[PDB]
Amino acid sequence: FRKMAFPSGKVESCMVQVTCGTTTLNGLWLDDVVYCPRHVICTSEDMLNPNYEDLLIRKSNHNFLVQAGNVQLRVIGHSMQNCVLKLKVDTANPKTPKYKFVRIQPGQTFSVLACYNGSPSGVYQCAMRPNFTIKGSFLNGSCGSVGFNIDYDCVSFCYMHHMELPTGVHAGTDLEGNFYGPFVDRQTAQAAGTDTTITVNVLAWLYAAVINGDRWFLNRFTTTLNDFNLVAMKYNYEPLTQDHVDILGPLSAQTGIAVLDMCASLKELLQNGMNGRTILGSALLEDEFTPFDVVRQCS
Amino acid sequence: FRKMAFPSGKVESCMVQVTCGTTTLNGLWLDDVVYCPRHVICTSEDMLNPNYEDLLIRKSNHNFLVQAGNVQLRVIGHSMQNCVLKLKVDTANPKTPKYKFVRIQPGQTFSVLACYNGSPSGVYQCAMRPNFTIKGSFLNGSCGSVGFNIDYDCVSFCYMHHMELPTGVHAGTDLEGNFYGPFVDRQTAQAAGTDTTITVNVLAWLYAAVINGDRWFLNRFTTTLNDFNLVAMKYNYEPLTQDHVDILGPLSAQTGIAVLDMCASLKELLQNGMNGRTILGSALLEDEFTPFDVVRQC
Ligand SMILES: *[C@@](O)(CO)[C@H](C[C@@H]1CCNC1=O)NC(=O)[C@H](CC(C)C)NC(=O)c1cc2c(OC)cccc2[nH]1
Ligand SMILES: *[C@@](O)(CO)[C@H](C[C@@H]1CCNC1=O)NC(=O)[C@H](CC(C)C)NC(=O)c1cc2c(OC)cccc2[nH]1
C-alpha cells in the first residue's frame, strides 16, 4: 500500500510557461486557451495591493510571453475569470486530452503535477483538507501547477496553485478561478480555519491496513454511529454520515468487518493513542486516502 | 517534506502489453524492441518448475501478441537475456525517450509506473531495500511494470517487476533481466534476507531537517567512519560506503556539518532514542529519501 498518483502524461503535454515582464509561472494549455493564475500580470509592487481589473485593461496581448517548450505561442486574446487568466493563443494544443473542470469537495483526493518554468517536475497525491487548504510541496515558480484526477482517459482538473500560507500549507483555486477557502490572491499572510481530520478516510486507511495484514488495532467492541461521532467530534474529527458508512461498504464486505466495528477500533485509537506502535508503517493516523483510493489500489 | 514521483509521461508512451496464449503482462517499447518478463511464455502449470530454454525453443515470432492499446506490433525477432525477453518489432516507437538501462544500489529511490494490460494505472516512489526487495503496490497483471529515474529528460530504467514475496514485498530485475537479490522467476515462495535501515538516507533526512532549521539533535562529537559502521550494524543499520560519504558531500557543504559529525549525531539518536522529540514532524527516522531526493525536493 502506497500513496499513489495518477499517471501524469496527459497533463504534462499541457503545461506551458507564461511570463509578464519579470513575473513568470505555469499555465495549462487546452485547445487554443492557456489558463494561468491572474497575478502573472503583477509586478512585485502590484502584488502587495493589486486592482486586477485595472492592471488587466492596461495589458496588451504582446505583453504575454507564452512558451510551450521551445516554441512561443502568440497570444491573440485574453479574458479574466475570477482569479484565473484565460489567454487565447493562435495554436491549438494537439495533445489536448478529453477533460472537464470540476470543483472537488473537502476530503476528496487528487494528483498534483508540480511544475516550474512550464516544465513538469514531480507528481504526488494530495487531499482537499476540511479547512480548504492542501498539504502540498510547492516552491517558488510553482504557481499554475494543477491538480487532477483521471477517469477512463478523461482528465478532471480540480486545482490550480496560487499560494503558500505561513503555516506551510497551500491554497489555490478551481479552474473557474474560485478559491477553495477564505483566501485571496494578494501578497499577505493569511490563516486558515482550524483543520479537522477526515474521518471517513482514516477508516478507509484502517481497512487498507487490515487488507494488508495488520490487525493489531481491532477489538471486539462496537458502537452506534452517534456515539462514535460524539467521540470523533471531541478529537476534532469530522462527523461520519450514513453516506460515508455506505461508501465504506465494499471495504467492509471485503474484510468482513462491519463499519461500526471499525469505528469502535478508531474510537479506541483516539482515546488510547497508538502506544508507539505503527499502522502501515505510520506513527500517525492517515486521512488522505479516500475509500475509492483504497478500493482502487487493493483490488 | 514528502515523497514525489517523477512525471511519468515519457514512460507511459512506452508501455505495451505482451501476450502468449492466455498469459498477458506489460512490456517496455523502446525503438524497435519490446522488453518484458520471460515468464510470459509459461502456462499456469509451467511456472512451477520452468525450463525457459526448452520453453523458448518451442516459440516462434508469430506466437507473440504485442499490442500498443489495441494496435498489434508484429514481432520479427526474439531472444532471451537472463530473465527478460527481448521482442524485436517491425515499428520503432516514435515516442522513445532518451534513455539508459542502469542497475541501482540498495538505498536508491525510483518511480514505479504500475500498469495493467499495458495500461498505466498509477505512479509512486519506491526505494530499493538493502535486502533487494521493494515495498511496492502491485496487483495481478502488474508484471512488466518498470521503475525509473529521469535526469534532464533522459529516462534511466532500473527495475522491471516480476514477483511478490509471501511477506508482501516485491522483487524484480534490472532491464538486462538480472534479479536484484537472490530471487528466481518461478512460482515458489521465496524469502528475502533480513532487512536493514538505509543509513545514507537517514543521514540525508537529518541534513534536510537541518536545512529546515530543525537541528536540536546536532551534538558536539565526531566519529571515525569505521567506528560508526561498527556501531550502526549493532542497530541493524547499513554500513556506509565511500560512495555514500561522497553523495552526502553537497548536503554537508550546504549546512557546514561534516559528514562524520552527522554520523556522530545519528549514533547518539540510535543509542539514546528521540526522548519524545520529533524531526521534521516525525517520531520515526525516515530512510527512503536519498541525498538526491533532498536536493531535488529543496
Ligand atoms: C507562485 O509561484 C506564485 O506566482 C507562488 C508559489 C508559492 C511560493 C513559495 N511556495 C509556493 O507555493 N505564489 C506566491 O508567492 C503567492 C502570490 C500571491 C497569490 C499574489 N503568495 C504567497 O504564497 C504568499 C504571500 C505571503 C505573505 O505575504 C506578505 C506572507 C506570508 C506568506 C505568504 N505567502
Ligand atoms: C505478475 O503479474 C505476474 O506475470 C505477478 C505479480 C504479482 C501478483 C500479485 N502481486 C504481484 O506483484 N507475478 C507473479 O505471480 C509471480 C510469477 C513468477 C515470477 C513466475 N509469482 C509470484 O509473485 C509468487 C509466487 C508465489 C508462491 O508460489 C507458490 C508462493 C508465495 C508467494 C508467491 N509469489
Numbering used by the authors:
A (entry chain B): 3 to 301
B (entry chain A): 3 to 300
Paper text:
The main protease (M pro) of coronaviruses plays a key role in viral replication, thus serving as a hot target for drug design. M pro is able to process polyproteins to produce several nonstructural proteins (NSPs) necessary for viral replication. The recognition site of coronaviral M pro depends on Gln at the P1 position, and no proteases in humans share a similar cleavage site. PF-00835231 is an inhibitor designed for the main protease of SARS-CoV that emerged in 2003, but its clinical trials were suspended due to the rapid disappearance of the SARS outbreak.
We then used the co-crystallization method to determine the crystal structures of several M pro mutants of SARS-CoV-2 in complex with PF-00835231. The resolutions for these structures are 1.79 Å (M pro G15S with PF-00835231)A, 1.68 Å (M pro K90R with PF-00835231), 1.65 Å (M pro M49I with PF-00835231), 1.72 Å (M pro P132H with PF-00835231), 1.64 Å (M pro S46F with PF-00835231), 1.66 Å (M pro V186F with PF-00835231) and 1.91 Å (M pro Y54C with PF-00835231), respectively. In each of these seven complex structures, each SARS-CoV-2 M pro mutant molecule appears as a dimer form, which is also the form with enzymatic activity. The interaction details between M pro G15S and PF-00835231 show that PF-00835231 interacts with several residues, including His41, Cys145, His163, His164, Glu166, and Gln189. PF-00835231 was not found to interact with Phe140 in M pro G15S or M pro P132H and was not found to interact with Thr190 in M pro mutants. In fact, the G15S, K90R, and P132H mutations are located far from the PF-00835231 binding pocket. The results clearly showed that the ligand binding patterns are not disrupted by these mutations. The IC 50 value of PF-00835231 against SARS-CoV-2 M pro was 0.0086 μM, while the IC 50 value of PF-00835231 against SARS-CoV-2 M pro mutants, including K90R, M49I, G15S, V186F, P132H and Y54C, ranged from 1.2 to 3.7 μM.
